[PDB]
Structure formats: C-alpha cells, structure tokens
C-alpha cells in the first residue's frame, strides 16, 4: 500500500526501509 518514504513520512523511519507486508508502520 506504500509507494515511498514520503508516503509514510509520519513513520519515524518506517518498518524496514520503505514498506513491509503492504503496510507502513514505524519500528
């Protein structure tokens, strides 16, 4: 569901590096 870091800027630094399991979540 993610496209890039910008698409998940709300996340501290995403889960892995841009997206995982089609779901964007901060570690």
Domain positions in the chain: 1-27
Contact predicate 22/1, CB 8 Å: yes
Q: Which of the 8 DSSP states describes residue 24? A: -
**How distant is the alpha carbon of residue 7 from its chain centre?**
7
Q: Please give the Cα distance from 20 to 14 (Å, whole number).
A: 9
Distance between the two ends of the chain, CA-based, in angstroms? Answer: 17
Tokens of 2: 């993610």
Dump the DSSP string for 3-20: -SSGGGTTSSS-SSSS-B
Q: Is 9 exposed, middle or buried (0-12, 13-18, 19+ CB in 10 A)?
A: exposed
Q: Which of the 8 DSSP states describes residue 23? A: B
Q: Please give the Cα distance from 14 to 18 (Å, whole number).
A: 6
Tokens of 25: 């979540």
Query: Cα–Cα distances in Å, from 11 out to 1, 3, 21?
Result: 14, 14, 15
13 phi, psi to nearest 5 deg: -160, 40
């Amino acid at each position: 569901a993610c496209v890039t870091h910008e698409d998940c800027t709300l996340l501290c630094y995403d889960t892995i590096g841009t997206c995982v399991d089609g779901k964007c979540k901060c570690m």
